Design an enzyme around this catalytic site. Sequence first.
Site, PDB file in Angstrom:
ATOM      1  N   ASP A 129      -0.026   5.157   0.979  1.00 57.53           N
ATOM      2  CA  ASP A 129      -0.210   6.083   2.099  1.00 57.53           C
ATOM      3  C   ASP A 129      -0.038   5.412   3.468  1.00 57.53           C
ATOM      4  O   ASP A 129      -0.811   4.532   3.841  1.00 57.53           O
ATOM      5  CB  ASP A 129      -1.590   6.761   2.025  1.00 57.53           C
ATOM      6  CG  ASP A 129      -1.726   7.726   0.836  1.00 57.53           C
ATOM      7  OD1 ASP A 129      -0.723   8.369   0.468  1.00 57.53           O
ATOM      8  OD2 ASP A 129      -2.841   7.850   0.277  1.00 57.53           O
ATOM      9  N   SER A 165     -14.275  14.060   0.478  1.00 55.66           N
ATOM     10  CA  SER A 165     -14.858  13.138  -0.507  1.00 55.66           C
ATOM     11  C   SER A 165     -14.970  11.671  -0.080  1.00 55.66           C
ATOM     12  O   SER A 165     -14.290  11.223   0.821  1.00 55.66           O
ATOM     13  CB  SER A 165     -14.101  13.220  -1.827  1.00 55.66           C
ATOM     14  OG  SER A 165     -13.020  12.312  -1.848  1.00 55.66           O
ATOM     15  N   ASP A 194       0.864  -1.158   0.000  1.00 55.09           N
ATOM     16  CA  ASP A 194       0.000   0.000   0.000  1.00 55.09           C
ATOM     17  C   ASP A 194       0.919   1.232   0.000  1.00 55.09           C
ATOM     18  O   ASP A 194       2.095   1.135   0.356  1.00 55.09           O
ATOM     19  CB  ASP A 194      -0.874  -0.056   1.240  1.00 55.09           C
ATOM     20  CG  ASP A 194      -1.478   1.263   1.578  1.00 55.09           C
ATOM     21  OD1 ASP A 194      -2.353   1.705   0.815  1.00 55.09           O
ATOM     22  OD2 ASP A 194      -1.080   1.845   2.609  1.00 55.09           O
TER      23      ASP A 194
HETATM   24 MG   LIG Z   1      -2.074   3.029   3.844  1.00 54.06          MG
END
Ligand SMILES: [Mg+2]
Lengths: 245, 245
Positions: free
Chosen positions: A10, A177, A8
């Site tokens: 972030d 969002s 992943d």
């Molecule tokens: Mg992450």
Amino acid sequence: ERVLCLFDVDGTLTPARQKIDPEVAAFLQKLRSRVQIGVVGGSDYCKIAEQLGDGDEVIEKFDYVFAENGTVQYKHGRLLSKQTIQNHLGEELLQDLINFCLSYMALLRLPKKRGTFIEFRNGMLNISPIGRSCTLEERIEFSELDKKEKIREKFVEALKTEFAGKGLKFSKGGMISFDVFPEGWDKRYCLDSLDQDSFDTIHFFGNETSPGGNDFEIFADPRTVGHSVVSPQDTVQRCREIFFP
Amino acid sequence: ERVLCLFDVDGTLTPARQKIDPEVAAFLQKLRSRVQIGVVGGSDYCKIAEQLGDGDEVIEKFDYVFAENGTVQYKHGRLLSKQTIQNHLGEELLQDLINFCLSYMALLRLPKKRGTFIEFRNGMLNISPIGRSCTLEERIEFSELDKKEKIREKFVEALKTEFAGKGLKFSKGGMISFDVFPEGWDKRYCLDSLDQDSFDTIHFFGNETSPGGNDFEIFADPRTVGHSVVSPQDTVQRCREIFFP
Ligand SMILES: [Mg+2]
Ligand SMILES: [Mg+2]
Ligand SMILES: [Mg+2]
Ligand SMILES: [Mg+2]
């Protein structure tokens, strides 16, 4: 013997929405001498590309670049086509969704509104009840308002109820969002293509592997060896322990 | 003695939405030996920049680049700040507008819908009742549908009535979309800044100078010497006649 490490972005390789530390980056290339490496993020390709090098270098530095949960895929320097949310969902359900979102947002009377309430991507609709077209002061302003009025959250509750049993998932996109995608188009989507590349082992690393998080489903999937990490340093740590013991 | 020639883009210098003929381009530089030259278009800067050279060359080739009717302005190679539609309109009217558009579009049940129904620019809201996020086959498809169902046109009729007396203007943006801007933010907007640059004469050339057209108001304005043209060849023709007789 054929091993892939799949990260992943972030919180796992990079500070959230930010450039990678040259030291992590440096390690990932070292890891690459033993195994192939790839990333999977919820964001679009350009966003991911920005965080991980200059311009389009990311596709050269990583063996796999899966953006938008894998609906968009780069593999060994080159683009592989993408399925379209509308091909998968079909036009009728997609428009029921869209009109519901429009009709709900029309009834929201806020301090301010801006533009691009519904952005049509490859593997999702990104819905922003204020407007994707705002500045930093305004992002923070709506972010505060959202917390207080639970705007996204109430909208999602209403959407999930309306479309109950119809195969849509909702997860927030951080500030202002939320995403709407077909069931199965979370991070697990990338595994279907990876199935065809004959890996003996697929290690997945993510910082949201707890239930609820955007890393959960791919982490728990029996096609991967799952790993939970808290930071980019935790990630490097773990890869050292497993691949360079 | 200080003269500016100011050209509309689509139909006046270039085939609509397309690159300029190197021969027109070549002439415009020749014209520049006698007078300063500039362009004004309804489109955003990047669109205008694309049609008129490579990358950002347009700001070097033209003395003035007025995009979005002049709400965005380049002058002698450099950007001058832009007023914001929201600073001018204020938040309340702007949101009445936005919510009206959302509520109207939610009730449109079409063959298909896509994304980005309301795009917030500097000098307008661009409204697209299908979705700015479509391909070429889809642009043509909705274009046909719009003609048959008068989608944009009926939407505009309803908007003009609702906001009667409140200072908004509507003009179509060709295919699939229409613009909403404050009264006065047609092409004439650029003249206010040009007033400060001490031109003895401002020649304007446009191909929509008939009433109704997007060139009418700037053409008719007593601050310009107005010229009506039918093609890029007609434009070059006229400039030859006036400046190179
Ligand atoms: Mg992450
Ligand atoms: Mg697993
Ligand atoms: Mg024109
Ligand atoms: Mg005039």
